[PDB]
Design a protein around this ligand. Sequence first.
Ligand SMILES: Cn1c(CNc2cccc(C(=O)NCc3ccccc3C(F)(F)F)c2)nnc1-c1ccncc1
Lengths: 61, 339, 609
Amino acid sequence: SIAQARKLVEQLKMEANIDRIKVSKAAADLMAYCEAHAKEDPLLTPVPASENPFREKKFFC
Amino acid sequence: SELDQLRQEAEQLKNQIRDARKACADATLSQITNNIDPVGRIQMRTRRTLRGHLAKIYAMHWGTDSRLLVSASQDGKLIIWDSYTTNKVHAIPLRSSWVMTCAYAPSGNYVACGGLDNICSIYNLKTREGNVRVSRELAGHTGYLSCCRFLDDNQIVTSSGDTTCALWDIETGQQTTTFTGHTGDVMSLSLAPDTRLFVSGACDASAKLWDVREGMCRQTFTGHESDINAICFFPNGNAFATGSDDATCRLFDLRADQELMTYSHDNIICGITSVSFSKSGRLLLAGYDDFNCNVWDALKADRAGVLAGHDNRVSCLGVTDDGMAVATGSWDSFLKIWN
Amino acid sequence: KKILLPEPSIRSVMQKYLEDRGEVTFEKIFSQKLGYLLFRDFCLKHLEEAKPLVEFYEEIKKYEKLETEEERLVCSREIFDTYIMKELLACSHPFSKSAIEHVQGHLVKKQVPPDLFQPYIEEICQNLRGDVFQKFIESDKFTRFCQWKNVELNIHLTMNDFSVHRIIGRGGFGEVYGCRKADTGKMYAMKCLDKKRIKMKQGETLALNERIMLSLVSTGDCPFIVCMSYAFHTPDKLSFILDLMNGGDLHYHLSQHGVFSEADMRFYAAEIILGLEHMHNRFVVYRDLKPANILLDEHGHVRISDLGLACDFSKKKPHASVGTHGYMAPEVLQKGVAYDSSADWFSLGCMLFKLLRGHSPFRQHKTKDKHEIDRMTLTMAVELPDSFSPELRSLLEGLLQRDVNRRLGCLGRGAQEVKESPFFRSLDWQMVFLQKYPPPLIPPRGDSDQELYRNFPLTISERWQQEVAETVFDTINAETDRLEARKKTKNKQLGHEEDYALGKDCIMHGYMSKMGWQRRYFYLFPNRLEWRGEGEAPQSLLTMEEIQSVEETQIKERKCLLLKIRGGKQFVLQCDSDPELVQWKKELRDAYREAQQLVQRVPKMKNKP
Ligand SMILES: Cn1c(CNc2cccc(C(=O)NCc3ccccc3C(F)(F)F)c2)nnc1-c1ccncc1
């Protein structure tokens, strides 16, 4: 563990160094992202059954 | 005694990092989202059963075409399925019985698997001579292969029971970059969409974010109380989710550098085995050793629905790239496709 | 009622059975008759660089058996020219300088002993031991070895496995019959005894002694002892399967013919002396040498018979009075005096004197009173008629010394001492052994108790293999080849299942049967036991993790494996043969124990709350 504690120190040097953002901004963007892509999420916004392979789509290529 | 001064120095830095974060924690996701409408009751049903593995299924992975998927089983086989029809595209009998994971390459040209062989075997599914064959055995790890994901046909990232991860040049068959840091076996990894970073989750109860080019751990997320079994990236690349033996899922933000949300309920006591988001990020689907897959409102922490159609542990799941479908694989030997 | 070999897939199971016991080695296989025959077959036809060595080997072995020096002088030169000078000049001679010189050095001086080529035997074996041998194991001929070895290790003899003809010799406990073994056709004598009569006479230790002495004596294919091939029991009898002898005993023939010429006694004694040499090299004193116990075959050649009084003197030396009174030695009669082989050499001289004169040297026509018989042994130096030759005289005086440290066979070197007597100076003992001297008499054509008898059944590998090699071995090989050529041609027209065991990590495979009997083909892997019906691939299995235990249980008088499963469920497996039982039991236990250790390490694979 002679060396072991030394890289642990300097690894934290790296980790503590990055500049951060507030959670409000973080959460705001996640929330915003979802809302922008909600229309394109088939588990949220169902598509016509005839375009759904797992319900009624008949032609496939 | 030199080690004295370095452990306290590690604490003063432990605290410094907690401080910078505590300072950023001005609100919660739950508060910020408390206004938006709930997703409502999600009641998906099973649209396909995949029958053909002879024992426990341990891992699955979708093709980028949202149609084909590979699964890996206790029976010693990979099976590549065509979900649309139920047909089998290939049955790959493996050299080692003890496989634990499998990956499908973005191109569709290869698949990978590994397990207690401590080897990541790359299967070429487009041999000049119309055959399926092992085209490389990536040897190097000193523990069991726990997960793996292609970046491209010539590159792949693997996690191991030896506590490490690595990037491989498939032609060279060597570790280009190794990723050391974890103190317990690594269980899972997820590539960022840009594939410049990836996160790992390990039995040390923490997840790390890695720079693929530099080979360094950039950030390290704690909070979980037991082993992290599963991990995946939120679709924009700025956050990721994890599932753990502590019966919780959690969502961590990269830029905010901390946990935003915990998904649990007093009933759910079993451990999480697998996690993935819907195409938009709004849903977080997670598999349990209680035989169900729970669907969560990733933004509000509400349980939105249950997928209950397996008679043993749900060991793996995946959401198609096109978002149309969820695949669950179980210890009962079946995969089901839900919609 | 015929031999049928298992299928080639039995190799998977049998090779491991043999590896576990160190039997897959050159020495062990090469020194078994059928192993030898299969190994020569491999070299002669399927491997070019082995051919000359085996050819050379069999030429030496033929050379060993040549009778006269002049025959040997001729054949030695043939062998040298063919297998030595030619190869040497053909740069095809993989043997040492020392080897070449030893023979050539001897051949130049016309010294041609039977063992001239021994150093070449050693170096042939050296050249066969390694790669050649490994290539043998890779081939179909080792597979055929396994098929035959399976049959051997599975023998359970009954009465139904024979065909009895007619009685021969009653005794105290039981009797002897003439039989034919259906399997092959080999004619044997079946000596049977009754446990009830044995129990009623408490002769358990007697019956016991004979089987133990018989196994100690029934290897080497000795011509001059009635040897055993098998032993087995039924609820009611013990069965020895002995070499057949139709010609009756010398006691009977002495009574019909009357006393024999010196020339004719010489013949018998010669054969007897080689019998005793055999028992004495294996540390056994026969102890009841008398004319009743010497048996004649159809040609008139002789064998020593009933071993019920024979004794093992290697470890502990016997002191007890045992035998018949007119043939025991001073040592044998004395209170608590040790003796060894010396007893028979006295007995022998007593019995040879009987053949010559009609009675024991120490019996002057009395019956119950062995006491006089005994005291004439311990004081009276035997009077011989002037009729005797002095050659015969010295032999009988040698053989009949009362001091052990004086008599023939006793101080120095056993049988060799007797053989060197003047009486036998005309004999060539190589010929006496090969049974070439003409016999003087051609006989004329026309519940708790049962555990004492455990470990009584027996098969003498060397005996059984000999029987097979001299009857069916050839024809059954050709037959069972034909079957497999048909099955090979069959499978390719049915799109052959390019074997499911290849190129994975299968531990073992082969047939067994279950209930849920249903016969399926099984493949054992580290984490599971798969199985299948014929046509399909395996579509059902058991995992190692769910197997709790592997006990053994009996079902309708048959041995089967009982596997206990996690959910309180049970699995019964039946095997074709005893080695399959032993080996599926072991490998299944090793596998499940080792897998359940692995899984416990792997947090993704083990069970949790
Ligand atoms: C002639 N012969 C004998 C003679 N001995 C014999 C035969 C049958 C039964 C018994 C027997 O009961 N033996 C046990 C026994 C019974 C009573 C007294 C002594 C002994 C003994 F010490 F000899 F074991 C012996 N044994 N085998 C043969 C025989 C061998 C080959 N071909 C034909 C016959």
